[PDB]
Amino acid sequence: NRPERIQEAIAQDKTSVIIDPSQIGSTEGKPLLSMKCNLYIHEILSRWKASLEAYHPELFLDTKKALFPLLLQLRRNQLAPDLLISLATVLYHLQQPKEINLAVQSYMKLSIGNVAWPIGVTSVGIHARSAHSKIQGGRNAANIMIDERTRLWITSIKRLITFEEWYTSNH
Amino acid sequence: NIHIPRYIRNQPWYYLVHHRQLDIDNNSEPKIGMGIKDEFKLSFCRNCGEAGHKEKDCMEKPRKVLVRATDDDWDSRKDRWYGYSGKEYNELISKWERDKRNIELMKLELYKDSVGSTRLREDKAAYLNDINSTESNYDPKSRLYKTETLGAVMFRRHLTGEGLKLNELNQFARSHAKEMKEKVQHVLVANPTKYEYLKKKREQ
Amino acid sequence: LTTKERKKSRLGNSFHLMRELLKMMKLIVDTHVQFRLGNVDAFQLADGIHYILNHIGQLTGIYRYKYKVMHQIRACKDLKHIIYYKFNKNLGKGPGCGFWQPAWRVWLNFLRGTIPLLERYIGNLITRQFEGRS
Amino acid sequence: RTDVIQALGGIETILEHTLFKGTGFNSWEGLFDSMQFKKLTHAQRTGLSQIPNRRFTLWWSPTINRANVYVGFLVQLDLTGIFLHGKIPTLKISLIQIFRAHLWQKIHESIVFDICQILDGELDVLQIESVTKETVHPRKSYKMNSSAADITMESVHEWEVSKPSLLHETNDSFKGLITNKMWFDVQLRYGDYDSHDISRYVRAKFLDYTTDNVSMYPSPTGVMIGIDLAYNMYDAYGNWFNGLKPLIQNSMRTIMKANPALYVLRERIRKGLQIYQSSVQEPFLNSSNYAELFNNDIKLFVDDTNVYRVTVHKTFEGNVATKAINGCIFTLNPKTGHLFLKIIHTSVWAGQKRLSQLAKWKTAEEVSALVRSLPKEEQPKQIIVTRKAMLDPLEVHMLDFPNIAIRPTELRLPFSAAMSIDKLSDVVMKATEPQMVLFNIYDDWLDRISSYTAFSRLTLLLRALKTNEESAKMILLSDPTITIKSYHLWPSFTDEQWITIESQMRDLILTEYGRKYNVNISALTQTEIKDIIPSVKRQKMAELEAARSE
Amino acid sequence: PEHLRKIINTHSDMASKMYNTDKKAFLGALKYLPHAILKLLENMPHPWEQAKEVKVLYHTSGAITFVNETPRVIEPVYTAQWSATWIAMRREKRDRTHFKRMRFPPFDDDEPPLSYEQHIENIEPLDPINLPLD
Amino acid sequence: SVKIWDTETGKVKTRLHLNSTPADVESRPTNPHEFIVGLSNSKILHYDDGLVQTYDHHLSSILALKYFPDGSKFISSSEDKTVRIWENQINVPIKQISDTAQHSMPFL
RNA sequence: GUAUGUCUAAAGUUAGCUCUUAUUUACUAACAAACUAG
Ligand SMILES: O=P(O)(O)O[C@H]1[C@H](OP(=O)(O)O)[C@@H](OP(=O)(O)O)[C@H](OP(=O)(O)O)[C@@H](OP(=O)(O)O)[C@H]1OP(=O)(O)O
């Protein structure tokens, strides 16, 4: 029933993490890329279990609570296209030595990216022109802060980015 | 503190203090919930026999007491729920009691040890943990709450560590200015690497 | 809006006068509905109606687009000022009065006056919509 | 005038008409146009006359917008819950002016979620299962016909909630009702000279919204808190179980004293009425607290000079119109050393006009988006703005972040010369999307020295670039051997080379400063640092009382 | 009445081509709309009666609904009925400790007006303002 | 459709399927990567060996393009009378060249 | 900054002189030190 799924998916968990930068743009391999993005975040959290004794022993449980939706939505290919592509861009720039600044650049194309007016200033000033409605967004290409639970793991991604910086720094 | 003009400081003919009788005083404490203190104050008739009124203004049908009163204001006057014995609310209580009488991915995602099963909502700014009464141990202009760590009593922050190291550094710059173009180079932020490596050399 | 969407979207005294009389009538019919649904009492219906027919200048907004309504509004206020001090000789101050008959007569006489007014106004407007401007 | 004041009822009866109580003044006693000189237009002087009429109407706004109206139709403001009693134009413009950026909503939501934090702070005290934030309607904060539940408490064990009483009732009945589910509804009202008694109002709204035939609430038991904004008042009517009444009393005094949403409301009523009495707690940057920047916290600068840069060109008829070029937001962390350089593309300005104020609000939006992307363990505990006009939009968009110490500065920090740097200008101009390009300012500067040395170096270099641009560029681009690496900005100098560069830049700054202001020399050392980069007299007193005591 | 009610129910969609001339009728019926408002407010049901089943003309397209009959009442009966409601409302302002006035407007702006047959016709009406005649 | 053909073999480097009928299609003298396509929907698109940066300041269909000595800037002219000197991957014109009597600048 | 004006393939109609270069002057700019239009 369920323990055979445990056996199969842990024997698959122990069976690659190097994201091919051709497979980021290769949209046909979306389940395989989503599974690799799942497993590299698992590898980050497995490393952060190990060095927890001297770096933030209070946020490991919070990030485990917060990535539980992302671990839910990465194993069976449950994300948005641009969101998954930008996440894979982060995790490819997160495996290289000096690309920590490029990792946070890919994060800032994840969190805001292409879309202008991310929150929306929502009718400031007096006059409130007729074109002044298109510079606010609750939906319809506003941000990717469209949920508490979604932004929670988006924040946890840069938590793992900061841990990756600290982990490659003091080793 | 004479921002008061001449005519307000000029008292009336008999006897600053004569005005202070909304409050003119403190006004930064937000005001209390005051409210529904209520009061109900209080020949003869051919129809009913009672005194006071005539047949044209009698209240019983022609056969052959407490008053909504003591009013000064407007919001007291309209008051759709002025008298209140809780009738309609207990009726809706009774209606509510009548209505009151009548999968594996969670198990797959515990591969890491969680076996539990527009702002942040976990911020909790330190005026909310200042829920007990203090003498304004927060300001909302600067949005800076005071503690004993990085806080003082007109005041500044505790320059802790790096700030204390720059206190050492600009006091070293003042010492090198008050001891030793070069007329301009006497201070810290003018020629910074100069005094930085002089303070590094001084520890040898 | 734009300004072009403020020039086509302003309308005259006629369309707004229709809108305000239908606000008035819908307040009347909705208080009778809140009666008929079983929510509100008949006494509270009569006080609600007498509140309508003596706060048309507040609840509705017909005073804006036709200002001689103020005559009838003043008369309704004046009828209020009579009726609340013959209904409340031994009662003092408070809601509960619902003798809505003469204010109702005043608004019916207003409608008696502005049936042909609104016939001519809306006839000219509707013939501008279909037939067009001469 | 003395007897006029005594005949209007003293000062109390005058100021009950006014919007004085809506302002936050520690006392009444602290109550007491450079545009007409500009050549603009004959017709635009009408709006110049229009400006003080707005503050006169806003000062007398509770007695102008009051409820004893002989005839007047209760329209609602645009996007807020203020009910006018007639289309009075300047009053309506002043209430759009105060309550812009959905500040009403940014009050309401804020109070709601702050109560959530209190109920997330007091879970075990009240035996609460889970304080549920409700996904409410986007226009719920000003629909006054009917409302819904902002917060819904769920309980573990069911609650003995009382009959409905006020927040300040001294005797309750904790026996009557029995429910497993409270709710909460924060209400807001702009009280006026007639309808400002808040307890009657909140009792009317609670007995109004539970007792509809239409159902909106999950239970008939709840607490409806109503804040009167224009008279600085509050009251909460509803059902109270054990321990909730002193909690909500202390909580509402805490919120109503120290909410940043309510205080941005009060600051906007102060500045809209052009009245101010300032007691600046934890003051702005000086040469005194210059090291207050990187006191080992998390912090960010916000520079907004080159957000809306323009190029003008003649436009076929004679006028010289003004196109919006790609701009930058120069978000500098001085301690750790990142640079969250926001690249504002021209597609931000799709068909918008009045682009200056809208650029200030867009800069506040990007700072709020940046901070929301960061975790609440990397949320910067202070934000130092660079310009004063940035404070009005930013203190609204950081209403979601009450942890963050928004500080002004009294240093003209020369971060506007960021376009003088070649690679910053390249990543500004070469853009298609509104991009977030990152740098380390401190790139060769964090293996050898800490943040203080090279932040002072950056101040010296950028003031030299802002003063005389291509002279300092030729000083940077002097020795053709010393190049710039691909991920660096500044040329990879050695330390004596940095001493030579800093000496030439300091000589350049003070050379053009003397050649601009014909001043001889700085007669004081802190004056010289203040010249490189209120409390000027306080540091005069400090150095007078510290250089004398040796 | 069900024929009228079906016509009014079929004119809630109003998106087919077939309504075109019927839609012409709607814009023509505005210059006969306010007359019908008077014909409501003359035939407005008095507080002593529950609901007054009234004659009414309806257009075939259901454009405009003119309440047909005029309210004629015997004069001494009319002033006696209103005086009975006068004394009854005086009694039920005095003996009632708390009078609850209606909400205004009684419905939300987002709420459509209710159908008579699904919400009002199947609920029996309440008891009107009647003095207890001995 | 814009096609980059070798003079030696004649193979497919890129195939720019576009939105509008393209105008003259030119290349910067420094890089074979840097590559500018004019359109007729008032836009100009810079490319590498793949969009890089748009160019939208002409109001009309753009007619003809040039460059500077050894490139490093760029010249555009349209069905409007305007000529705009754009730079190496910069939207903003240094100069826009217009009088009241100019017809247009169809080739240059 | 308005009014207002202008552009916008989805659909396929049949065979002395020439010159570089700088200073000055004039007119313009909702471009800068939260708001102002006929
Ligand atoms: O303000 P006041 O001078 O004390 O008069 C009020 C006022 O009547 P006016 O319209 O003449 O000012 C009220 O009318 P509104 O405020 O509602 O417009 C009315 O209340 P209602 O109309 O709701 O009945 C009330 O009458 P009362 O409170 O007795 O019902 C009446 O007070 P007075 O009877 O003392 O004049």
Ligand SMILES: [Mg+2]
């Ligand atoms: Mg004009």
Ligand SMILES: [Zn+2]
């Ligand atoms: Zn009697």
